[model samples]
Target: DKTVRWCAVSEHEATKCQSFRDHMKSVIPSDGPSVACVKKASYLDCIRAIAANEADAVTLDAGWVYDAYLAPNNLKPVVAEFYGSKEDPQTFYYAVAVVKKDSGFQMNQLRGKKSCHTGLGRSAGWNIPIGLLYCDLPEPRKPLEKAVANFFSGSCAPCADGTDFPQLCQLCPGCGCSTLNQYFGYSGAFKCLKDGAGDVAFVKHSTIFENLANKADRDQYELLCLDNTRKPVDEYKDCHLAQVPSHTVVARSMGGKEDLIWELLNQAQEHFGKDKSKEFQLFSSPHGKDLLFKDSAHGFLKVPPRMDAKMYLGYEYVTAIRNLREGTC
Candidate 1:
C-alpha cells in the first residue's frame, strides 16, 4: 500500500527503475514508499495495468496519453519533465516541417514528394502535418493515412509499417517501423532527409540543430513555413506546424498515490538528477536514450492538480489528433 509501482515499458527502462529503487535505500526518505518496477508488455499495456490497479505510474509522450485519459483508464499527468535546467524549465517545443536549402518547392505544392517523419501519431510528424492536409480533403474525408500514403512519393514515417502504406518508411526500412531501420525518431527523420533520401522531414524545430551541432552545417537546411515560404532553421517560432507540449508522467486519476509518487521522484531528482549524484543519472541513458524520462530533461515540475490529459495537451492538439481518426475506413 505504501509502494509506488513504476510501469516500465522495456528491459532498459525496468533496469533503470530497479537501480533507482535500490539507490533510494540509502537516502533519508527511506521511510517513504518504496519504488517498485513492473514491466508491462508495452506502454499501452502499462496504461491498462495502472488502470487495473496492477501498476501505479508511467511517463508517457503527449501523443500516447489520450487513451489513458479516455473511458475506462481515466489517468492524469502528475509530473512533467522540464528541459533546459531546474532553474528554468522550458515547457514547449515547436513541431516543424524541415527541408534542405534550395529545394525550390513550396509547402502547399508538395504532393507526391519524398518525406520523412518522426513517427506515426507523433505530435509534429504524423498528427499535425496530417491534420493540416486533412483540411484540404473533401468534406467527408477519406482515411487520412491512405491520403498521406498517396501524398508522398516515398517516406520514412518510422513506426508506420510499409504495408497498407508501402511508401511510408520505405526510405530506409523496418516492419518498416523498427528503430534499426535507421530512420526512427526526430533525429532519424532529419537524417533521412539530410542523407538525401527524402525531400522533407516532419520533426521538431530543434531537430536540425540537434543533429548538425554547428550553425554552419545547420544552415544547409531550412524550415518549411505554413505560409508556403521557407525560413532559416532558427526561425521556428513563426514557421511551424504546431507547438507540442512536453512529455509527461501519468497516474490513475484517483487513488494514484500522487503524493508518494512525487516524494519518490523529488528525492530521486535531487540526488540522482543531472550531476547531483554519481550513483544514477535521471535524464540520461545510452543511444537507445530516454529510458525512464526524456533524455535531455533537466528536472521535474508538478502538474497542476486540476489538469487532465486533454488540458495538458491543449484543445487544438486534441482536435488535430481527433481529426486523423475521423475517416478511418
Candidate 2:
C-alpha cells in the first residue's frame, strides 16, 4: 500500500525506471515504500500526472518546474540536484551559447544562424535565452515560435513538429519531434553542432566538457558572450548568458509522500550512487545515457521541508520563465 509512483519520459527510461524499482526491492527488501514506474509520452505529461495524483514524483528540468509551480495542480520540489565541488555545492549551472571557435559571429550576431536547442520548453535550450531574446524582437505581439523561426534561419527544437510549427523542426533529423531522436538533449544538441548541422548550440555549461573532454576537440569550441564578444569554453562563470536552477524531483504538495520518497532516494544513492560499486547504478544507463537522472550528476540534495516550487527555482529564474510562458501562450 506504500508505493511511490515514478514517471519516465520514454520507453527506454521507463524500462530503466522499472529496473531501478526492481533493484530497490532487492536491496532494501524490508520496510521501505515500493517503487513503481509510470510511463509518460513527455515531461509535461509526467508533470500533469504527478499533479493530478496519478503519479507521486518525477525529475524535471527547471523550465518544467516553473510550469508545475503554477496552474491547476501546484506541485512542490522535494529534491535538489547538487553539482560542483563537495566543499561548495551549487544548485544551478550556466546556460550558454556554444559555437565553433572559427565561427565568424558574435552573440548579438546570432540572427539568421542555424541553431540547435536541447529541446522546446527546456531550461537552457528554450526558456532562458528565448525569454531574453523575445523582448528584443521588433514584433512583440508575434507568436514566440514564429518570432524564433524568423530570428534563426533554422533550428532543431526536438519537441516541435510540422503541425505545431514546422520551422522549429526544420533542422531536426527525420525523427519526429521528441526525445526519441538522437539529437534531442544536451548531448544531442552538441552532436548537432559537432556534425556541422547548426552554427550555434544552446546547452548547459558542462555539456561541452562532458562530451568533448579532449583538449583538441574542446579547443574547437567557444562560448558566445552577452557583450557581443566570445570566451573560451571554460569561461562560463564570467561570460555566460544566465545561471539556471538545477533540475528537481517534483510532486504534488498535498497527497505526495515526501518523507517516504526522500528516504528511498537517500538510501538509493548511498547504495547505488556513482561512487558506489553496486551492480545496479541508480543514475547510469548502458543502453542510453541519463536514463532517469543526468549521468553527470553526483547525487541528490534534500529540498528544505517547506520549499515550494517557486522557492526552489529561485525568484529571478521563475519570473523569467513566467514571462516567457506568458508571451508564448
Candidate 3:
C-alpha cells in the first residue's frame, strides 16, 4: 500500500490527523503516497508501534529522542521542525529563566521565590532548568521533584507527580497537568508571570518576545544568566541554562520510508506551512495546542544523513537527562 501512517497521540491529535489524511487525498498526485492516521495511547506507544511496523512516523519532543534511540527500537529523526521562517530555519532554542528587570533577584537567589514552569517533562520549562537546580542541591536524598518544590515558595509546574508537594500546583488555577490547565505551557506560564502570580517564569527564549512583542514591553523583562547576571532577552545564546535541539519526526531506522515521509512533509508545508493555507494547516494547530506539532513551528528541515536520536539530541543534553534520573547532576 502506498499509504503513510501517521501515529496520533490523542483523540484531539487523531482528529487533526484524520483531517490531514482527508486533505492529502485531495491534493497529492496518484504517484504520491496516500495518508493514514493511527491512533496511539501516547508518544512511547507510537515509538513502539513504529518499531513494530504499525505506523510510519510521528513527531517527537527532543526529550523523547533518547528513549526513541534506545536499543532494539533504534528510531532516527527524518525531519526537523523549524520556527519563524525557512529563510532562517531555526532548529534549536534555549531554555531560559525570565524575570522582570526590577525584580532584584539573580538566578542564584531563586529559593523561596514564587515561580512559573511550562510543565513537568517539558525540555525548556522543566528538565533543563530543574537539572541545573537539582545539581545545586545535595543528593536528591529524595526525588528531584521534592528539591524543586521546596526550593520555590509556591509554583505551578503542571503534570507534577509531586502529589505530596501540593505547592507545585498551588499557583495553577485549573487542571494541574492536562491540556485544560489554565497556567500551563509556554503561553500560560508566561501569563502567570505577566499577571504577577510568579516572580520568575521558566520557559523558552523566544517566549519573551512572543508574549512581549513591544519594545518597551520587552525592556521590562530580562533573562537570568548562569553567571548570576541578568541579561537582555536576546542574550540567550550567552545566558541560557541549555541549548536544546528542536522537536523532530521519527521513523524506524531499518525501513522507515524517510524519503517518502520527507516528500509528504515538503508538499504539506508547501501548501499548508503557515499563512499560505486557507484550508488544512500541517504545521499550525488551530483546534488543539500542539495537536501533532507545535503551532509555533514555521516549517520543516530535513535531518542530516544517518543522524540518530542521540546524535540529534546531542551529548550534553543526553547526559543532562541521564544525570537528572540517576546521579546528583
Candidate 4:
C-alpha cells in the first residue's frame, strides 16, 4: 500500500538492511509498503534530520540513543531486534586501552597525565574509553569534561611531534611509550602498539586478544584492567553508555507518511526474520536492548542520570547556545 524508505550511514549497512527486507517480501505482499533502504553519513546527522522534520524514524547506536539520552520525553522504541548472539547476550565487540608490554606503565599511571581518544564525535572512538576511564581513575586525576574536548580538538600530542594520540582512540598502537613508530592510519593504531609506539592506547578487547594471540610480544603489551575501582554509578549493563545501533532506517519527515512507513518496516521485519533470503543473510527486527549492568540477563543495566548530559545532540546544542550567554563553552 505504501513505500517504506530507509536510510543507513554506510552503503554496507544499507545493503544489510535491504537484505533483511528482501526476505520479508517473500512472506508479505511484495507491494505492501516495501522497504527502500538508503545510505547516510552519520547518526548525529540522521537524528538531526529526523528532529528537523526532514526524516521519519531513524536507527541509532544504543549508546548514542539510549532511553536516558534520546527519548528524555515520550518517544517509544519499536519492538524489534537485529543480529546478536543469545549466548553472549550483550552484542559483544572488542575495545581496550593499551600500552607497550614492557613500558613499565599501567593505565592507572596515566591519571592527570595526558590521555587521548581517537575522535570526539564517535561513540566507540570517544565515549566508550572515556566512560571506562572515568569508572577507573579517582576524581582528582580524571579530566572528565576536558577529556572529551581534548579528543575532539586533537589536543593531546607526543613530545611536540604534533601527532595526536586521542584522535586515534579507535586505533590503539601509536600513543604508547615505546618510541618505536610509524603512521599506519586508523587501523594502524593497534599495530603501532604491537610495534611499540607510545605509552598506551584504548582498543576493543576482542581486537587486543586476537592480535596478542598471534604475536611474539604477546606478553609485552598488557590489557590494563580497572575492575577494582568502584563501578561507575550510572554504568549500564551493556558496559557501554552509547547504543551505536548497526543500521538506522530513515525517510523524509515532510510530505511523507509516518504511519505507513512504520507499517512497512513492521512488515519487513516480520517477513525477513521468518524466511531466510539468499540475496544476503537477513534477520528481522532491530537489536535487543543492551542491559547496562553486568549481572543482568538483558545484557544491559539501566542507570539514572546524575545530570541531563544524556540530552539529544540537538537539545545539547540548544543548551550550548543558551550557555554562551553565561560565558561557558
Candidate 5:
C-alpha cells in the first residue's frame, strides 16, 4: 500500500486536503492507487521537504514555484491556480506594495529607500515587490545595506517598538523624508500609521481596499501604483493588479501512476464547487489546474519541471528579520 502523500499550507488547509483525498477516493478508480497523508510545517516547507526527497509532493504558492524554477531543481508542477474555497476571494488574493496616506513619496519614487517586505520568502508578498523595486532603480543600487543604515541614521526615530522606520528617517543619511514597512500576516497595517511606525505599508491590495472602503472614517490611507509593483490605484481602472502566478500543486514524477494521479485530481476539480467543496478549492480555483500554473492557458511549467524549494524557505526568514528591524506590521 504505497500511499500518495501531499502537503498543504496550515491545519485548516490540511483539513481541506483530506476532503479532496476523500472525494478522489470516491470517484477515481479504487484500483488506481492509495494515498497516505503527511503534514509538513508550512506550504513553503512542504516544498522543501519534497525537493529533499523527504516527501512525495506538495501544494504551495506559485511564487515559490517560480523561485524553485530559478533554483534549477527537479520540482514539477502538477496543477496550478487550483483554489479550495470560493467564499472569500481574499483567501486566494495577491500581495500589493503600499504606503501611508500622508507620505509625500509617490509610488515611482522608492529608489535607494528602505523598503519593508511582509516576510522574506513570500513570493507575491515580499519577493515580487522587492524584485520590482530593485529593477526600478536607476543605476541598480548595490549598496542596499549601506543605504538602509544611512536612511536610519539620518531620518528614522525609535518608537515604543524601538524600530519604527519613520522615526529612523530623522537619522537617515542625506535628509531622507519617508519610511516603508512590510507586514508578515494579512491586514491591520493601518495601526502602524497611528503609531508613527512607517509612512508606507506593503500589503494585500484587495484586503486593504475592502477594509478602507468599509471603514473610511477609521483612517485615511492612500494606495499608489509603483510601476510594475502591484499597489492599488483605481477600483474601476484595475490599476495595481500584480501579475504574479497562482499557487501550485506538485507531485513526484511517478512514471506509470502519473495518469492515475491526474485522474484523481480531475475528479477533485469537478467536486470542488459542491456544497461542502470548500476543501477542494481551498485557496485556488474550482479547477486544481489553476493552483499549478499561471493565469494563462498554458498548462504546468513542465511535466516534471525543475524547482528549488530551499530558496523560498530561506527567503521567508530573510524578509521577517529585515522587516522586524524596521518595525513592520
Candidate 6:
C-alpha cells in the first residue's frame, strides 16, 4: 500500500496529524497505509502541495474548494463533513452576521460599521456576506474588496494584504493582514468582537457556541437577520443571511487513490469517530479545536460518486461565489 500524505494546516494541526498517524497505525496495522503528516503554513500552501502531488488530501472550507476547482489545481471533493443528525444528515451550515447585543445595530444599518471576518475569501465571512451586501452596487464591476472597504469604516479581514487594500486591514489586530494576526479564523472573528475592535462579525452559525459556550458570554451577542431584525445567536437556523455548504476533503482529480482514501477515512471514523470511545478522538481535540475538521462536525459523509465541486456546493451558492470571485478580481 502507498503512504498517504495528509496536509496539516498549522503547528497545532500538525500535532494532531502526528497523533492521527499513530492512532491509525495502532488501529489498522494490517491494511492501512502509512499515514504521513505533511505540514503547510496555510490553506493555499496545502492546496498547492496537493496539486503538485506532494500531498494527498486536506479538509477545506467550501470557499477554498471553489478555489481548488479553478486554475492549475482542479481538485474535487472526496468526502463532506456531516453536521446534523444521522437520520437526517445535512451538508450545509448557515452564514450569519454577529453583533454585540447592546450595539443596537440592524442588518440594514451596517454601512460604515467596523467589521470582523473569518478571512478574506472564506465562505461564511467574505464570499457569502460580501456577495449579499454588495450585490446591488451601482458599479457591479468594482472590486468586491474595495466596495467592502468603502462600506465598512474599518475591518480586520485576515489574509488580506494591507499594502493592496489598507482599509480592509485597518482594524486588524496584527501588524498587517495575515494568519500571524490573532484575529483570523472563526474564533478570531468572535475575538475581534469581544475585544471591541469591530462592531460586526461575519462567521458561521456554530461560532457562537464554540467560542462563547457559557450562557453569559453567549447572551452578549446577537445575530443580524436578513429581514432587518435581530435574534439571539443560537437562533441562526431560522434567521441567517445564507445557508452555505459544508466543508469537504479534496484530493487530486486525477492520479488520486479514491478507494484507498475512503477506506482509511471510514475505518478511522469507526475506530475514533466522535461517538467512539478511544484514546484519540477523531472529532474533538483538547489541545486545539478544529484541528483536522470542524470541531462541530459529527462525521464524514461520502459524497455522491461523480459530484464535482459545483454540484457539491449547489447551484445558488456556486453562482454567488462565482459572482463574488469575479467582482473581487
Quote the positional error of residue 18 for candidate 5 in Å.
3.8
Per residue, candidate 6 scores C-alpha lDDT tens digits across 237-277 of 88898888888999998987766777778888888887786
Q: What is candidate 3's lDDT per residue for 205-317, written digit by digit as tens? A: 87877667698889999999999899999888899998788989999988889998998888888877788777888765656666687777898899999987777887888
TM-score-best of 1 and 4? 1
* Each candidate's clash count: 0, 0, 1, 65, 54, 0
Candidate 1 global lDDT:
0.77
Best by lDDT: 6
TM-score of each: 0.84, 0.93, 0.83, 0.48, 0.55, 0.93
- What is the C-alpha lDDT profile of model 1 across 211-276, one tens digit per residue? 687889888888889898999999988888888788788898778898888888887788888888
What's the lDDT for residue 30 in model 6?
68
lDDT to native, each model:
0.77, 0.81, 0.81, 0.39, 0.44, 0.82
Candidate 5 has its poorest 10 consecutive residues by lDDT at: 173-182
Q: List the residue pairs that clash in candidate 1.
A: none
Query: Which regions of candidate 4 are displaced past 4 Å?
Result: 14-28, 31-33, 66-76, 79-84, 91-104, 111-124, 132-222, 227-278, 282-329
lDDT for 237 in candidate 6 is: 85
**Total clashes in model 2, counting residue pairs 3 or more apart in sequence or in different chains:** 0
**Pairs with steric clashes in candidate 6:** none
For candidate 6, the TM-score is 0.93
lDDT of 2: 0.81
Candidate 3 has its poorest 10 consecutive residues by lDDT at 173-182
Q: Candidate 3, residue 104: CA error in Å? A: 3.1
What lDDT is obtained when candidate 3 is compared to the true structure?
0.81
Model 1: per-residue Cα lDDT at residue 107: 84
